[PDB]
């Protein structure tokens, strides 16, 4: 059977945990209908049975057939290529967009400065995104349906929402509809809500990394 290693809740073990690359395999799975055991492994304290086999103490890990599997697009790549159906696969002309949201995002997170311009460069990816979204047709990036894109996707939207209106009290501007639009769509996708971490879990999460010693 499938199993994945994922996360686990910061100060809640025994709670889904934060981590978006986890989330993106898990949205995978879900959205090829699979059944899975699911392993949540707490990163301060992480068992030794779990260092045997993915022997960074990185996470998401998927055991499938034989052997243990890490790094997400592999894992999702692996799924796709084994259980064809539904399709996930995204044209390759759009595969890369929103590819640099979580990182302006996480930089912005994290800035003491306010004018190191770490928000302009987020403002920039959410406008390029804003500008693929009005110009092609949806409700996802690559047409009807969800593909694999949008899941790896929405988990770091996720966080940017999540985080930047906890710490910051920041909200994508109502300049970017569609960008709304996609993230209320992505939000209440069927999988989304069967594999979201609660808010709680991306503030314990993030708490430790927002401004550390």
């Known amino acids: 059977a499938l199993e994945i290693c994922v996360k686990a809740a910061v100060g809640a073990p025994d709670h889904l945990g934060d981590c978006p690359f986890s989330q993106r395999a898990l949205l995978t799975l879900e959205e090829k209908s699979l059944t899975y055991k699911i392993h949540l492994i ?17 996470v998401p890990v998927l055991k499938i ?3 243990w599997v890490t790094d997400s697009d592999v894992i999702v790549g692996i799924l796709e290529e084994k259980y064809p159906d539904p399709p996930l696969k995204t044209p390759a002309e759009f595969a890369s967009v929103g590819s640099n949201i979580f990182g302006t995002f996480g930089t912005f997170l994290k800035s003491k400065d306010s004018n190191d311009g770490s928000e302009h460069a987020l403002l ?9 979204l009005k110009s ?5 990036i690559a047409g009807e349906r969800v593909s694999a894109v949008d899941l790896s996707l929405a988990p770091k939207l996720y966080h940017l929402q999540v985080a930047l209106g906890h710490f910051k009290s920041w909200s994508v501007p109502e300049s970017f509809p569609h960008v709304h639009n996609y993230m209320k769509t992505l939000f209440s996708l069927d ?12 503030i314990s999460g993030w708490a430790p990394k927002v401004n550390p010693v």
Not at 42 to 58: T, V
Not at 124 to 132: P, Q, R
Not at 136 to 140: E, I, L, V, Y
């Open 124 to 132: 920039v990816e959410l406008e390029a995104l804003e500008n693929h």
């Open 136 to 140: 092609h047709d949806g409700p996802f």
């Open 65 to 67: 057939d034989d052997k």
């Open 191 to 202: 999988s989304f809500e069967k594999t979201k971490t609660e808010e709680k879990y991306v």
């Open 42 to 58: 707490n990163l301060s304290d992480k068992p030794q049975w779990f260092l045997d086999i993915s022997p960074q103490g990185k």
